[PDB]
Design brief:
The PDB classes it as hydrolase. Keywords: Endothiapepsin, ligand complex, hydrolase. The assembly is monomeric. Endothiapepsin in complex with ligand (3R,5R)-3-(2-((methyl(prop-2-yn-1-yl)amino)methyl)thiazol-4-yl)-5-(3-(2-nitro-4-(trifluoromethyl)phenyl)-1,2,4-oxadiazol-5-yl)pyrrolidin-3-ol (CBWS-SE-171). It is a single chain. The chain is mainly beta. It contains 4 helices and 24 strands. The chain folds into 2 domains: 170 residues, Acid Proteases (Cathepsin D, subunit A, domain 1); 156 residues, Beta Barrel (Cathepsin D, subunit A, domain 1), CATH 2.40.70. 7% of the residues lie in helices and 44% in strands. A 7-stranded mixed β-sheet has the order 18-17-12-13-22-14-21. It has a 6-stranded mixed barrel with strand order 2-3-8-4-7-6. Strand 19 and strand 20 form a beta hairpin. The longest helix has 8 residues. It binds ligand IJS. Ligand IJS binds next to strand 3 and helix 1.
Length: 330
């Protein structure tokens, strides 16, 4: 089997991408944030505290003839920004772009933190990291991809995120028309439950390439590119007026600037992020100070190849017995 679904930016900055997902019978379509950095499929629901729902589409398990309570199961998750959600668990039929998993764990939120409530466009998350990170207790549950994998034509999914435009998540096949050149595959460590890999280095703008190992994760659920402070300083040093602001929370730069590109290495191959992809616009409405799309990972503990990096590439998440990641230009 295969599936293919369009993913759409939630706003003009590409802060996140939402993909329609069919849950239950008859189908209830929710727009979920596909997150290769986590492993829970959770949704706003008829059980979510009413004051914490503000425009989201909710899953109502009582209206699904295929929903079954996973008795005694609870879940609770916290993300990198301090946001959080928790609740109980149903199993139900979940379909993405024509690919169907029966008995998928659908984690129904009883509580969500304010950042989720405030984002009316995200109805939940669909985790695509390794199932070892799934938070369901006392019986850990598998991701949608893990459940679908054996049925797929090839045990892979691909992320082709757009720049200020829709893109595509495919399951079970590689669309050879969606990228230029060849896909370079690179080794993955699953030891922390992520799609963790080692970039071979970087370049800023038209500069030469700096060969250096950068261990990080391919994370569709993170907006920006988080890299070591040395690398990030070398980038922003090329932008007149750019500086790190503790009050704003990262590197800012004059909105009047044109930004240099940023290249990262995948083996001997190179992915070039255009400068415009690094512009996240005014720090607040009407400001002439703009927020940068490349930020330091120093406080995080891990480097994160988030959407800023991934949207410059066609990315293969290969879930074969030995997982690998593939990157191609596009
Ligand atoms: C600090 C530290 C060290 N560690 C914990 C960093 C890590 N972080 C992760 C992830 O959880 C995996 N992918 C990312 C993700 N982020 C969101 C998301 C969605 C919606 C919202 C909204 F509420 F604003 F709508 C906010 C977020 N958000 O910023 O968390 N979804 O997925 C982050 C793995 S390791």
């Amino acid at each position: 089997s295969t599936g293919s679904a369009t993913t759409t930016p939630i706003d003009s900055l590409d802060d996140a991408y939402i993909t329609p997902v069919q849950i239950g019978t008859p189908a209830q379509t929710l727009n979920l944030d596909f997150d290769t950095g986590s492993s829970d499929l959770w949704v706003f629901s008829s059980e979510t505290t009413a004051s914490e729902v503000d425009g989201q589409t909710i899953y109502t398990p009582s209206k699904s003839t295929t929903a079954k309570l996973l008795s005694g199961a609870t879940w609770s998750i916290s993300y990198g920004d301090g946001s959080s959600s928790s609740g109980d668990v149903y199993t139900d039929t979940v379909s993405v772009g024509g690919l169907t998993v029966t008995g998928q764990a659908v984690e129904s939120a009883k509580k969500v933190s304010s950042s989720f409530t405030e984002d009316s466009t995200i109805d939940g998350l669909l985790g695509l990291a390794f199932s070892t990170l799934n938070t369901v207790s006392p019986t850990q549950q598998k991701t949608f991809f893990d459940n679908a994998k054996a049925s797929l034509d090839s045990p892979v999914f691909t992320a082709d995120l757009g720049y200020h435009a829709p893109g595509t998540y495919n399951f079970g096949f590689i669309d050879t028309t969606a990228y230029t050149g060849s896909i370079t595959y690179t080794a993955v460590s699953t030891k922390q439950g992520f799609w963790e890999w080692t970039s071979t280095g970087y370049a800023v703008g038209s500069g030469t390439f700096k060969s250096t190992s950068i261990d990080g994760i391919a994370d569709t659920g993170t907006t920006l590119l988080y890299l070591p402070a040395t690398v990030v300083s070398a980038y922003w040093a090329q932008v007149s007026g750019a500086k790190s602001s503790s009050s704003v929370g990262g590197y800012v730069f004059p909105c009047s600037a044109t930004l240099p590109s940023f290249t990262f290495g995948v083996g001997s191959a190179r992915i070039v992020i255009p400068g415009d992809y690094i512009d996240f616009g005014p720090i607040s409405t009407g400001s002439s100070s703009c927020f940068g799309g490349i930020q330091s990972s120093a406080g995080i503990g891990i480097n994160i190849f988030g959407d800023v990096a991934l949207k410059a590439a066609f990315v293969v998440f290969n879930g074969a017995t030995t997982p690998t990641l593939g990157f191609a230009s596009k």
